[model samples]
Target: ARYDDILYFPASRYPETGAHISDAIKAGHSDVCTIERSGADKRRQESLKGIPTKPGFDRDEWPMAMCEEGGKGASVRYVSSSDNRGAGSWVGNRLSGFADGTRILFIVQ
Candidate 1:
């Protein structure tokens, strides 16, 4: 119901992700997101269906595909591969311990 859970994304380690996430939050995507454990693959597929990847960068979705807030209308950005993978893994690992549907506040610092 509330953003009782927290997930931190370090800007120092993931700059492009930080920028994208910060911008995404300001643009109306929830800084607090609900986890969606099962629909991740489907959401990611639908959200990224026609979006092509960049040569040296990776597609990053705000409200991420793993979140219930994701899917349609989620902001998509291009971030460095390292930032994308690293930040994503960090988020995934953190959320892995929490239950699905848990509301998490995403922090970029």
Candidate 2:
């Protein structure tokens, strides 16, 4: 299976833990961009805190610009999973240091 998902964190009371990355898909930003970041880390928590203007598919600087500068932040892009298992492994490998069972369900349709 191909994983074309983006994990995003909407602005809410659960900003630290994150609400849902899938929310971007509903907003119609799917195919354009996605977001991922460590909501557990105080310094990196705000990386994916806002709504995106558009998908970050074609532009390099656009996605890069969404990332946190000085510290570890979210990665807004398209993540793929060649295996049938799912994106858990991909997210685990990429966004390390989080507690086990952390959900990474946000993605593009």
Candidate 3:
């Protein structure tokens, strides 16, 4: 698909990203986008198991790999703000950087 046929957004923009997606569907661009990770993140690597993959599918075409009943993959759950534990504590830590926006990439067909 051409660039004009695709929509892109930052991962941090959740509800905003979803709104554009809803609008696009209303306009008849039902194609969806998905995100995946590669390399050292053990969580990401494990998620690929048992999931069907298309050989030629590019980043933009990832949604095609999804199953109708929610894709099969590893899962990650975020620590709630109320839980002041390890991972949760790091989220509020600011010396390095505030846990505002996570770096993620998204694309829509």
Candidate 4:
């Protein structure tokens, strides 16, 4: 999958590619970002807080951002996810510490 305005906090084994990353660079998104020290500590609590209260895919997921210069904020925007077959976009408000989650829905035409 791919995404625009998506920040990969704490690093990940898999990186973003395709039109998402391309657009990000064009839009001036930061690549060298890090997670905050306090974030690393509150991660456990945050993790628990992220559990969805509702059923179905309409649930919220954790969104993380880079912590460069020990920054204290997150980049919020819509994200697009695509595969070899097709792509999908959704609105997600990511924040520095605790942020909005994900809601994946298949839109067919």
Q: lDDT scores for all predictions?
A: 0.87, 0.32, 0.30, 0.30
Question: lDDT value for candidate 2?
Answer: 0.32
* Candidate 4 pairs with clashing backbones: 34-67, 61-101, 61-102, 74-96
Candidate that scores best on lDDT: 1
TM-score of each candidate? Answer: 0.93, 0.21, 0.22, 0.26
> How displaced is residue 23 in candidate 2, in Å?
3.5
lDDT at 44, model 3: 37
Q: How does candidate 3 score on lDDT?
A: 0.30
Q: lDDT (0-100) at residue 13 of candidate 4?
A: 21
- Per-residue lDDT tens digits for candidate 3, residues 1-109, read 3212223532343333334434544554424322222222443334455555444321111111221211333232222223213222232231123121223222532
Candidates by lDDT, descending order:
1, 2, 3, 4
Candidate 1 runs further than 4 Å off: none
Error of 4 at 65 (Å): 2.1
Q: How many backbone clashes does candidate 1 have?
A: 0
lDDT (tens digit, per residue) of candidate 2 on 1-108: 223334543324222112123443344433232233432354333444552444422111212222233123433433222221133344345545543333334432
Q: Answer with 3 or 4, whichever has the higher TM-score.
A: 4
Candidate 3 or 1, higher TM-score: 1
Better of 1 and 4 by TM-score: 1
